[PDB]
């Protein structure tokens, strides 16, 4: 029993009935509405509002905790890149130097299900994690390619593609989801753990509580 009797109520209210559009948390230019938080209800599919927001709390957490310099891409990044190549997203990282970062998180929205890609500048490596045991073969290539461009574009210099690699975590390596609704939570937790250089030791079984914890974490823009 690790969730306070009071917090429970708070979490309860956010999820309960009320105006769908009612704003409940504002930050990173995002307004989380009761309608968004709803996606965290059991068996509910998470939407971009929740994810992008969580993805941001992670950066702040890492920042105030001393964990690796974390940079995060919007859930809209990959899709756009996918369709329009480098040009479409070129000005997406204008105020920043990707390569000065340490860990880059890229939320991946595949048709009907969330996935995640972690870029570790520290080890010149792209990692694709998927709680439904998919492959990031092509996805990783597209992203790496993206990097080649941003480097040659933003700092006028090729990447030594020889020292770069990309493994696709196989089902027996990371926890897989057991019900068809948590891909979002998994993407989110994978990120949480990876951004802290923490070895993934959670299972599908914790996801239900995680869901509840997240809503709290969101309302208080503070991770637990």
């Amino acid at each position: 029993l690790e969730l306070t009797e009071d917090m429970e109520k708070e979490i309860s209210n956010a999820l309960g009935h009320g105006p769908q559009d009612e704003i409940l948390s504002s930050a990173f230019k995002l307004r989380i509405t009761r309608g968004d938080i709803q996606t965290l209800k059991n068996y509910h599919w998470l939407n971009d509002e929740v994810i992008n927001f969580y993805m941001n709390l992670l950066v702040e957490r890492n920042k105030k905790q001393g964990y690796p310099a974390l940079h995060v891409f919007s859930t809209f990044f990959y899709p756009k890149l996918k369709s329009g190549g480098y040009q479409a997203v070129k000005r997406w990282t204008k105020g920043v130097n990707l390569f000065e970062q340490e860990i880059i998180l890229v939320p991946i929205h595949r048709k009907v299900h969330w996935s995640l890609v972690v870029i570790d500048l520290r080890k010149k490596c792209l990692k694709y994690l998927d709680s439904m045991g998919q492959k990031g073969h092509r996805i990783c290539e597209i992203l790496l390619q993206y990097l080649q461009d941003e480097s040659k574009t933003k700092r006028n210099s090729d990447l030594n593609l020889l020292e770069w690699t990309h493994h696709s975590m196989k089902p027996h390596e990371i926890p897989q989801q057991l019900n068809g609704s948590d891909c979002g939570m998994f993407t989110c937790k994978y990120a949480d753990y990876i951004s802290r250089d923490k070895p993934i030791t959670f299972t599908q079984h914790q996801m239900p509580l995680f869901r509840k914890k997240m809503v709290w974490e969101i309302l208080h823009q503070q991770l637990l």
């Binding site: 230019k29 307004r31 919007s74 299900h113």
Partner: protein
Amino acid sequence: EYIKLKVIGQDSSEIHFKVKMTTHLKKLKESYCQRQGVPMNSLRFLFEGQRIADNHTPKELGMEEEDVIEVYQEQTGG
């Protein structure tokens, strides 16, 4: 009405707008929303990858003439 913007969508659907740099962009969204008949919350407006808040402004975001404001649809996954 100082600037003219191009609000493009995922399906290539363009829509031009003449707006007052002095004003919030919420207005521009509300009109795009109806001129399309799509609920507010089901849409997301971004400028160069940056999400456009309601009280945000053309002058704030520093949008030059004929700039594109990209529109995206809510995403969900299981």
